[PDB]
């Protein structure tokens with residue numbers, strides 16, 4: 001009934017690869033992210049996005065089609081990507097990484113609970129709102145791995161090589177959930193060391209061979225404290241059947257270690 005409420009001005013480019021624009025409502029000044037896709041690929045991304053509703057998953061508000069162009073109305077996260085909070089070769093303070101890792105697990109538990117695998121978890125796909133709350137973004141490579149309580153094994157090779165689990169390079173078929181668990185472990189490694197451990201997880205990769213031989217005196221492992229390193233030892237396990245599951249990540253000692261204070265709240269003295 002209110003005129004002009006459906007009008008959004010595109011005020012700035014947020015990302016590319018089509019593009020993601022910052023859209024501001026003409027009347028309310030509400031900020032959303034509009035993903036512009038110049039076209040089955042986007043049809044599956046829209047259908048998976050309509051299933052999503054969680055505080056650590058980028059919100060989907062709706063979609064509009066202007067002939068050949070698809071417009072996806074998605075949550076605006078003013079904090080940007082987790083990628084730009086990682087200082088090269090340093091990482092970030094361990095309590096900040098623990099808090100981001102808690103929020104990443106909550107989002108992944110949610111997705112896996114409704115039978116969705118993201119398949120491309122990496123810091124470029126983890127967005128931060130104004131309060132630094134993590135949001136899993138971009139369901140362009142996501143798929144349903146469980147339907148009618150029946151698990152379907154995956155075979156499609158996808159994701160990003162430094163974050164992919166070794167079974168995707170070695171086996172024809174693999175379970176979906178240990179693959180996302182592995183990529184979260186590489187995110188945790190990146191957050192605590194500011195560097196990726198290997199180009200890809202194969203025996204032909206020397207840094208990967210060094211990890212399987214427990215050469216933790218080498219980088220990036222030498223920069224990581226023993227408590228989060230003991231967790232990484234459980235996540236970055238070559239055999240996906242022996243790899244730690246999320247319920248067991250939730251019982252890990254470092255995972256449950258008190259490290260971070262709540263957000264700074266205004267206070268006065270006397």
Ligand SMILES: N#Cc1cnc(NC(=O)Nc2cc3ccccc3cn2)cn1
Nearest residue numbers: 014033058074075076077078080137138
């Ligand atoms: N796919 C997808 C997607 C991409 N971006 C979404 N939302 C954002 O607010 N993105 C965003 C916000 C940024 C804010 C500051 C700097 C860089 C930024 C990069 N990207 C939502 N979904």
